[PDB]
Design a protein around this ligand. Sequence first.
Ligand SMILES: Nc1ccn([C@@H]2O[C@H](COP(=O)(O)O)[C@@H](O)[C@H]2O)c(=O)n1
Ligand SMILES: O=C(O)[C@@]1(O)C[C@@H](O)[C@@H](O)[C@@H]([C@H](O)CO)O1
Ligand SMILES: [Cl-]
Length: 316
Amino acid sequence: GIGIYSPGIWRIPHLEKFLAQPCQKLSLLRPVPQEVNAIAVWGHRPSAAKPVAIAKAAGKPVIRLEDGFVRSLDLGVNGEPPLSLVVDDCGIYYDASKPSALEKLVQDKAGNTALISQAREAMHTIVTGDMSKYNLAPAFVARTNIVLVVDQTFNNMSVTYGNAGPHEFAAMLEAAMAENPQAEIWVKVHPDVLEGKKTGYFADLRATQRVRLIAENVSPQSLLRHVSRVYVVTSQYGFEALLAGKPVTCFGQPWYASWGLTDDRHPQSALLSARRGSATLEELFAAAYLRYCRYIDPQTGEVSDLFTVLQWLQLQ
Ligand SMILES: Nc1ccn([C@@H]2O[C@H](COP(=O)(O)O)[C@@H](O)[C@H]2O)c(=O)n1
Ligand SMILES: O=C(O)[C@@]1(O)C[C@@H](O)[C@@H](O)[C@@H]([C@H](O)CO)O1
Ligand SMILES: [Cl-]
């Protein structure tokens, strides 16, 4: 029932197990069939624009896909298939300009309360089992007052649609340095940049004695254990820091900002917080990791759950 134009999407292994619905390939060169009840695209990739306009003009709704928050062993830039996808029938999680399906799941508190025991169980497995979106980095080993500043991939869609850009990165690091005069500043490069497939926002940062550059691929939770507080623009690292029990200052508008849990600096923070309301950490985790994300079994490709994928990711 769902039409897909993107060959890249069409090509995702076990895609049909993620969508839980029949899917069919559509061509831009002919009308959308009436049978199609929705059109699915990848986030806001440039390829999504033409299918979005088509769907609008035929009155069909758009579904936006993206990788899950526990995705795979190696990076997507290296061609590793995903073990989790998100499926968003309202917007997409990283677009702060309007509600996403994730935002409405967070606000459905009753539905998150029903999952609190699974959420606590999975949260513990992630923090003490040292898990993250990617899971091939080795644990970190090595002053005690450390401020973590998180770099990202240049022009990533979670920055642009989270109302940020190069300025918020410069402002983030100047704020980190100025608000913690005696702390040591640690700038973590994104693994895609370390893989040489992307560039960072601090490409031309000059390191000092107080500003140390961490250009090593290390697992988030292990590095977080040595940090006092975290500064982000929009990175998923920010939510993982909250799971580690660390304070988080946000300079863009990611999916986990403006719920009452983060020190939000974006100029439109008050507007977004008014729309979102309040939420607990466990509500956010249940909504995002258990309800918004879908999983497949890594050995069979059949529909699965977070716990099965966490288990299979942990022995490697
Ligand atoms: N500076 C950074 C930024 C991201 N990452 C990794 O990349 C994942 C995704 O983060 P992004 O939203 O920044 O793409 C994180 O969960 C984390 O595993 C990292 O290890 N160091
Ligand atoms: O259409 C896509 O977006 C694509 O083919 C390219 C990348 O998004 C890449 O992540 C790929 C993965 O197979 C999905 O994670 O999907
Ligand atoms: Cl369980």
